[PDB]
Design a protein around this ligand. Structure first.
Ligand code: HEM
Ligand SMILES: [Cl-]
Length: 392
């Protein structure tokens, strides 16, 4: 028997600790023999698990297409769901607006908003770190980047959750219509009165004589919400969970805050939420396997992140690991636009949380829960801590 035959990113067996990592470790071991396997799930598809094999797929932009990023398919994501030439036109237009120098101007606002969120429950001595913090931080960050009051993020959070959970397509269309109406109002304001926020920057961007249309700008807003918020939330939730029980990791980050950036990269390797599809467009051989047009290949980044040929001691969080060429933020032409942003955001989140609440643990009377799928990680992380004080 092979673990590939029933591999299913929405149904990953969970271990006693609550995560899929025992299963991932077992699949990584099998991938040393069979780095690309056939799963019978979703009508049949390739599971690409070896690090070299994922790299070979993801570097191939001739035989694979990002029209297949979402799988199963039951609307185009700007850049993430597109191929060249349109992908490249959009990426060039947003490159400088979303540069590290530009997004770094928002760091101190992010730090303030993170402390404001912590204030909400610090006096209570309990909370769900995923619902209270991890889900809220990226949504408030989005609002901050757009020049809006941070609490406007609460609406973004609600939309993203609703869009991804409603069963009725008419209801889904109503929610998406709210989101689009907001984007149009924001765009009109930023066009008439440009500022220094990311939307103003994207509006003014011009490349080879051309600018983004209103539809393209709505698309950009949409991918910030639908491509950024859940990935970040699930990653941060997993990190908060790990810090709640891993007292040795925790004490080291408190004693050596200069190690937090390298630790963020190591936590990305270990808890990276994403698994992404590719549609096969031309016949192509990768290793021992020949893929055929119309098939789907799923890139199981978490397995590649544990490949012993790529990482020594892959099952350990070695916070000093460097370099760290993990695939959790992709690789090549679709590499995460948010890659710098989320590294800074995770540093701030960890730093402020451990500064405000250095003593905490998982709540023994409530359950954690791991969310499976293409964006995976802890969904509920109930913690307890000694009651503390609001900064405001
Ligand atoms: C921890 C949080 C995040 C993770 C793990 C993550 C992961 C990824 C991965 C793996 C890819 C490559 C997809 C592929 O190869 O098809 C990607 C692409 C992308 N991400 Fe992120 N992401 C995160 C946060 C964000 C945020 C906050 C933004 C907002 C800017 C963002 C925007 C994008 C966009 C626009 C792309 C497509 C880029 C392109 O196609 O050129 N992501 N992300
Ligand atoms: Cl910091």
């Amino acid at each position: 028997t092979s673990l590939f035959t029933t591999a299913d990113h929405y149904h990953t067996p969970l271990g006693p600790d609550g995560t899929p990592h025992a299963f991932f470790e077992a699949l990584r071991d099998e991938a040393e023999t069979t780095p690309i396997g056939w799963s019978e799930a979703y009508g049949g598809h390739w599971v690409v698990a070896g690090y070299k094999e994922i790299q070979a797929v993801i570097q191939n932009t001739k035989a694979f297409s990002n029209k297949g990023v979402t799988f199963p398919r039951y609307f185009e994501l700007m850049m993430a769901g597109q191929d060249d030439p349109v992908h490249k036109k959009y990426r060039q237009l947003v490159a400088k607006p979303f540069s590290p120098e530009a997004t770094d101007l928002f760091t101190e606002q992010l730090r303030q908003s993170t402390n404001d969120l912590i204030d909400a429950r610090i006096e209570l001595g309990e909370g769900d770190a995923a619902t209270w913090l991890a889900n809220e931080i990226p949504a408030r960050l989005t609002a901050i980047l757009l020049g809006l009051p941070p609490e406007d993020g609460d609406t973004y959070r609600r939309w993203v959750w609703a869009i991804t959970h409603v069963e009725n397509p008419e209801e889904g269309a109503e929610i998406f219509a709210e989101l689009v109406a907001h984007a149009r109002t924001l765009i009109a304001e930023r066009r008439t009165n440009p500022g220094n926020d990311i939307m103003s920057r994207v509006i003014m961007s011009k490349i080879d004589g051309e600018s983004l249309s209103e539809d393209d700008l709505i698309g950009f807003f949409t991918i910030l919400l639908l491509g950024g918020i859940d990935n970040t939330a699930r990653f941060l939730s997993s990190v908060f969970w790990r810090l709640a029980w891993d007292i040795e990791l925790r004490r080291r980050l408190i004693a050596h805050p200069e190690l937090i950036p390298n630790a963020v990269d190591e936590l990305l390797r270990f808890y990276g939420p994403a698994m992404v599809g590719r549609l096969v467009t031309q016949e192509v051989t990768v290793g021992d396997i020949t893929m055929k047009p119309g098939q789907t290949a799923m890139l199981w980044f978490p397995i590649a992140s544990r490949d012993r040929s790529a990482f020594d001691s892959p099952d350990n969080i070695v916070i000093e690991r460097t370099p760290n060429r993990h695939l959790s933020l992709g690789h090549g032409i679709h590499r995460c636009l948010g890659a710098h942003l989320i590294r800074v955001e995770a540093r701030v989140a960890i730093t402020e949380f451990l500064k405000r609440i250095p003593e905490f643990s998982l709540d023994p009377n409530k359950e954690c829960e791991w969310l499976m799928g293409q964006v995976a990680g802890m969904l509920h992380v109930p913690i307890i801590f000694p009651k503390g004080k609001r900064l405001s």
